[PDB]
Amino acid sequence: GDIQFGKYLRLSCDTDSETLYELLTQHWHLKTPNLVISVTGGAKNFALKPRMRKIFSRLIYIAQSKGAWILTGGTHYGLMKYIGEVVRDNTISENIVAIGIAAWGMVSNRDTLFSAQYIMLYILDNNHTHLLLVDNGCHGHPTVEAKLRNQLEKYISERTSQDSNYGGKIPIVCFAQGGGRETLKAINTSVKSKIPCVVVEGSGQIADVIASLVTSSMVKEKLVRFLPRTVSRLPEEEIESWIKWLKEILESSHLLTVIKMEEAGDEIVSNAISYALYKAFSTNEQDKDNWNGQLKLLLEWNQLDLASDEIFTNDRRWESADLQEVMFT
Amino acid sequence: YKAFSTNEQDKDNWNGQLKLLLEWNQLDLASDEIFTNDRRWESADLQEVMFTALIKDRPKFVRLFLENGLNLQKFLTNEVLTELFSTHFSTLVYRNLQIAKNS
């Protein structure tokens, strides 16, 4: 069903990611230079606050500035509704692409197929530019989003594009702010692949757990310290299924980066994303030998202190003929 | 407030706590403890307490209610408006408005 009041569609798990990307890009979508994806809780309850508004308005502005794609849940619940509202607001004041994936099974007031109009057991936002529903079946609304969104992100990550330096590749950064366990599972699977994640060290209950982490008894104590009601409700047997995951979160500190709550800088969003992305290139070792791509990447991302301290530093024979092209740029 | 919280007689009740904390001017406590997170108050929970806050001239509480998930359109759409206008009006304000309009 296609609805306009943006494009809509029904998604099947078996559908190949390459075919979906080809559809998107060829038909309605331009080449992607960045894929900022926000992962949070789909629960209606959210910790709305002025700080939460400020920590996301800058993100939206950066996404527009670089032309990045924004992937979200997109079911008109808390953070997702705010994201849709901010996308609309930016459109009012040269377009933003916001794909929102949800589960078909949960969908209520189903209107099967041709431009049917729906007016109104899952509610869906109508502000997203593109909205996708995926459920091969099981109308009981089981978790199905993870089976397709992660595969799409990984495929786009491997898709090489000769632009924005970064070894002719695409960033594919994950941004975590919600307190849901689904967010924890998404973080685990993303860490499984070569995708750096940045977590907010603020109101997020589970995000605060991960922030404090950076000794299973300490893990249990930290988990108890946050969301005590959920900790008590969960059975003891299932607790293991979480503890191991936390270890995987703390398995590698190279990728995981977090923001400082105390910092009140206006450009903290850009700086954090830039640093987290930069670490992945530095540690990848694919282009670590290459000493010119690093500077070209660091230039586009406004970072003077990092460029001065790391790129040039000392004991490097760049010579006067090394800066020609980068200085021109 | 601590005595009510620990009494357990109305600890299960989650609305009396906020009503108590409103009359006693405490914005930080109300924001941190009452709402906090992981509570499904919904948009229909703040109706009466927000009405009382409007009556009692609690601006900070009004802002906290509005920004924290409250929907003003639905609340205003109710007949409460009529009530809020039929009784709430100060008598001297009404008389002065009438004389000013006539003059």
Add this chain to the structure above:
Amino acid sequence: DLVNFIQANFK
């Protein structure tokens, strides 16, 4: 073309 692509995607 769009109809054919939609049919192929649906499978």
Add this chain to the structure above:
Amino acid sequence: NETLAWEGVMKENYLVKINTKANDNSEEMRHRFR
């Protein structure tokens, strides 16, 4: 309709400007010290 929405957006910016002017006291060093 559209003009009113644009007005609301400009209002958002105006209120943010007021908040920034209020916060420009640069007194956060006190709480940082604490």
